[model samples]
Structures are given as structure tokens and as C-alpha cells.
Target: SMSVKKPKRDDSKDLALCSMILTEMETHEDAWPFLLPVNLKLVPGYKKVIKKPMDFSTIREKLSSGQYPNLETFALDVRLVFDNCETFNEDDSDIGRAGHNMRKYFEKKWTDTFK
Candidate 1:
């Protein structure tokens, strides 16, 4: 709802936030670790998929499989990454701030590039 009219063709804003997410994930620098698990169960091999620094490709497939469902859901997923970071506090950390930006970006309606 917060987005303007959707661009009929590919556009920058359509991917700006996602690009930011990917950069944060892929850049081999200060990004924190993230873990994604298929589910919670008693199985021995059901270990968490630790994102050494996290990767967009990880969730891009997950999202393509309808795991996120919508932007808000995706935002929640991103928020959860920030939530798990013991070093990053939502109030003061840059990672937290970037996560907030991504979260809010997904909260709004953007071009259906990934949709």
C-alpha cells in the first residue's frame, strides 16, 4: 500500500530493498550469521542450515516455493534473522537498522518483480 503505481517494466525500486538484503547477505564482511531450519522435530539430522553470513539465494528459493507467501511474511523472516543476532540490538546496531529498512520495505506493496 505504501508504494506508488507499479512499474509495468523492470525498475530500480522494485529491487532496491531486496538488493540491499542480498548485499548484506553476500558481502563477506560484517553481516551476522543466520540459521534456517525446515522444522522443529526430534530427528537427528534436522540440524539448522547455518548461513555463515546468510545468502539471498537461500531464501529466494524458499520464497519461490511460497515459503514467505507475501512481503510481510518475508519481512518477518528477515526480522527473525535480526532477532537471532546476539551482537545486534534493534535500538543501536546498523544491522538492526538495515533489517528495519528491509522489514518496512516488505511491509509495503512494491512491484511484483519476485511475485
Candidate 2:
């Protein structure tokens, strides 16, 4: 049995961060409407959204159910889902700014979790 073992899931840190982001959106949907629809915000990006957007209601379910095995993968999943801004032109529009903010939020929290 020389096969590599898969790591066990731990949802504590990721769950807390994801839940916080979702709650923030729900608590202030007008300011953070970008947080909804989980679709990539840009038109081209939206065309390729693979799954339903994670909502405030689903954060707990997703985290506790091992939707992501660890914080690293969870962060990666968020980046993939939320990053649809112009590559280096985040200030181009409100939607671009929204995506930029999302990437910022997840990346920062991902770092904060390690520290």
C-alpha cells in the first residue's frame, strides 16, 4: 500500500472566512451585489460559469461537507469562481472593481489564516 494518502478535511479556518464574506454580502447586498450570482461578472466570463454561485445560505453546508479539503484548495476555488476582472485594469468599471475586491478578499484571508 504505497499509495499517497489524501489529507483529511478541516473546515474551521476556511469555513469562518467564507462564512464571513457571505454574511458581509447578505448584510449589505446593495453595496456588495457583486457577491451574488457567483458567475464571473464579465460577459465572457459569465458565459463559462460552471456551477451555481455559492450563496450566503450555502457557505456552512459547503464547508462542513468537505466541498474543499483544505484552505489552500478553498482559496483556489474562490479565485476561479470570482476572478473575472480585466487582467490589469481593475479600475475600468464597477464590475471590474467588484471582482478585484473579491480576489483581494480571498487572497488576504488566505494569508491571514496562515499567520
Candidate 3:
């Protein structure tokens, strides 16, 4: 037996639903900070640049020096935090799925935005 439902084609409705869910999650009393530092050593080169807390211009200088291989790696950390909210799940968490989605999101965003 097969059962199917009509797909909703309203992009605005989809956006509103996603926004509501995000707002609800964000407003939770026990809401977790949406960032996890993974392998800080991977981007050791940035340590020196970030030490003095310079502005964007200074950061861009280091980036242009070919020190950091890919800028997307830095930005994707935040994306992963949001996309993998389930990692901070309280019960029966699917950390692996969260990680998978993070990687997939980053790859797609990086290619689309940078390349």
C-alpha cells in the first residue's frame, strides 16, 4: 500500500514555519550556545592574527597572505553551529546526522558563495 500527500509549494509558508521553529528553539530557557570548537589546531595560522584582536582589514591581510587555505572553513563553524542544533539535543541525540548536515551545508554554501 502507498500513501502520499500533496506537496506544499508556498515558499513563504515554508520560510515562516522555519522561522517560527528557530524562534521557539532560541527562546528556550535551556537553549545551548550554538557553537562548538572542533580541532582548533586545524586553523593554527589564525591564532597569531587573532591574538591582538585586529579589525577586518587586518584579518583580510593575513587571509590574503595564503596563510589560511580557505576562509570558508572559518565561516562554516557558525553555520555548523546553527545547522547542527541537534548535537545539543537533550535526549537521544543524533550528533552524526547533525554533523552530516553541517558538512553538506558548508560544502554547498562554500561552493555557491566562493566558487
Candidate 4:
């Protein structure tokens, strides 16, 4: 009788990569705006506009809690943080420029590491 074999599926390496990437993002000079949830008190209607707001801290929590099923899922949340930044800010604004910069950095690192 032949037996089926399954490949090992471990997440330690991927999780560590994610943590390293997230750490870089958190330390970036332009990361301030993305480090935490947008201030609804300061920016009116933010919650209404971006129903699914995301941030570094939120992602960190998800990572720490092992909520992401895979690297792709983790990437989705990371991308969300940038997308929300663009939606809430003008292209020429400080935060908007930072978002663009951070997005560039993330994509480059992501490609180099994953792709």
C-alpha cells in the first residue's frame, strides 16, 4: 500500500520576516502617521470614510496574536495602512508624502525578500 505524504508547513521563518519588515516600517522617519490609528478627534469623519482603518500597532498586535493565516494575509493589512493614508490625505500633504515613501520602501523590501 502506498501512503500519501504531506510537506511540512511551518511559519516561524515567515513570521520572523514579517516582524523584521514591520520593525523597519515602525522605525522609518515617515512612520509616525502609520504607527497608530488616525485621531478621529483631530480628523473629523475619519472613521466614516475609512471603515477598515489599519495601523502598525494593529498589525503588530495581529502578528503577536498569530491572527494572520499567511504572509499574503499579513501583506494585505500592511497595504491597507497605506491605502487608508492615501484616502484620507492629499498627495501633496505631509502625511500623504510619507505614505508614498513608506509604501515605496515596503514594496521594495517585500519584493526583495519574498518575490
Candidate 5:
């Protein structure tokens, strides 16, 4: 018998879906803080505190560039956005609350969409 082509589903459809999720995240009310990289001038210690900064803008570019091999990779980058926020801001702080809310929203949305 001849060898069959790879039967596993391709990432094309999933990639577009990931893009859609990121779009929603970017528009979220609490997304302002994560829209772009933290200003080095404003938060001079940020660079020293966070080794790997992740933001919506960076995720958008990475997604567009096909940098994420799969949907999980996209999810990881998205999670990093919140993780960094939590690490840098106090739990009772405004930014911390926003990150918590955003993370909850993303988790629910992701579950509803794919799970």
C-alpha cells in the first residue's frame, strides 16, 4: 500500500482562530496596559525585573509572522502577558486586577471556543 499523507489537521485554520482571539484580547477594556511594551523611561526597573516581556502587540506580530508553531504556543505567549503583569504589580494594584480579569476572560473564551 502507498504511504498516506499526514492525516493530522493542519494549523492554517487554527492560526486564523488564534488571530481572532488576539484581536478580541487587544480590544478588551483592560487590555490597555498590555497593548505595548512597557516604556523603559517610565519603568526603568521593568527591564531589570522582567526578563522576558510579553505584550499584545508583540503577540500580534508573532502570530502574523507564523512564529507560533501551534495554538498552544500562542496561548503560552498570551499567558506570559498576564504572568508578567502579576509579577511586576502588587496583587491589590489596579494593573494586577486588570491582568486577573483579562486572564479570566481569556480562559473562559478559550474554553468556550475550543473546549
Candidate 6:
């Protein structure tokens, strides 16, 4: 009988990449709008749930569920939001800072809930 070796998958490395990409999208305002929608879909009914900008409690609920199947989809949304941030700027600096903080919050939340 012949034995075959399988490739190993690393969840930690994958999560790190996800975190890094998400962080980059948040920090760069130009990617905001595009990324936001993708991230929003991770939550069930997020399109209906969010009317305007998001609030913390609502986001917390979604991450806690742990049922979201599409991290790549979420990443795409984050990228889109980063791409389009300039179009929605009232004050770009404030929004950018808020995005950075929010991304950090989400990263921590995701790591805690998923890992």
C-alpha cells in the first residue's frame, strides 16, 4: 500500500490574513463603501437591519451568532467600503479614524467568537 501526504491548513494564518486585510480596508478611506456592504452581508438580514450607519450593539449581535459562512464575501465588502469612503465624507478624518477603531473592535470580536 502507498501512503500519501496531505497539505496542512493553518487557521491562525488564515485568520491573520483576514485581520490584516480588514484592517487595511478600514484605515484607507478610499475603500470604505465597497468593503462595508460585503461585511454587512455576514450578518443575517443586515441590508434590512441597518438603515443608516451601524451601531455597536447590532454588530455585536451578528458576530456572536457565528453562522456567517462567507468570510471572503465579508472581506470583499470591507474592501468596497475602503474604496468608496471619499464619496460619503462629511469629515474624512473623523470617519477614517472611526473606521480604524471599528475595524479593531471587529477584529477582536471575530477572533474571540470564532477562535
Best by TM-score: 4
Off by over 4 Å in 5: 1-10
TM-scores, all models, native as reference: 0.37, 0.52, 0.28, 0.89, 0.88, 0.32
Q: Taking the tens digit of each residue's C-alpha lDDT, what string does model 1 give over 1-115?
A: 5877765654335335564554445453444333333233753332443333333455666655656544556555555554444333454667666555554454343233355
Model 3 misses residue 39 by how many Å?
12
Pairs that collide, model 2:
none
Residue-pair clashes per candidate:
0, 0, 0, 0, 0, 18
The worst-scoring run of ten residues by lDDT in candidate 5 lies at: 3-12
The TM-score of candidate 4 is 0.89
Number of the candidate with higher TM-score, 1 or 3: 1
Q: What TM value does model 6 have?
A: 0.32
Whole-model lDDT, candidate 2? 0.54
Full-model lDDT for every candidate: 0.48, 0.54, 0.41, 0.93, 0.90, 0.47
- Top candidate by lDDT: 4
**What ordering of candidates by lDDT runs from best to worst?**
4, 5, 2, 1, 6, 3
Worst 10 residues of 4 by lDDT: 1-10
Off by over 4 Å in 1: 1-20, 35-58, 87-115
Residue-level lDDT of model 2, residues 1-115, one tens digit each, is 4787779666556567766754554454233634444445564554453444543344445666868676666555555545433442356677567666666665675566555
- Per-residue lDDT over 1-115 for candidate 4, one digit per residue giving the tens place of the 0 to 100 score: 2687687666569999999999999999999999998887888889789989999999999999989999999999999999999998999999999999999999999999877
Residue 59 in candidate 6 has what lDDT? Answer: 29
- Candidate 2: regions farther than 4 A off: 1-18, 21-33, 38-45, 48-61, 85-91
- Candidate 5 residue lDDT tens string, 55-85: 9999999989979988888899999999999
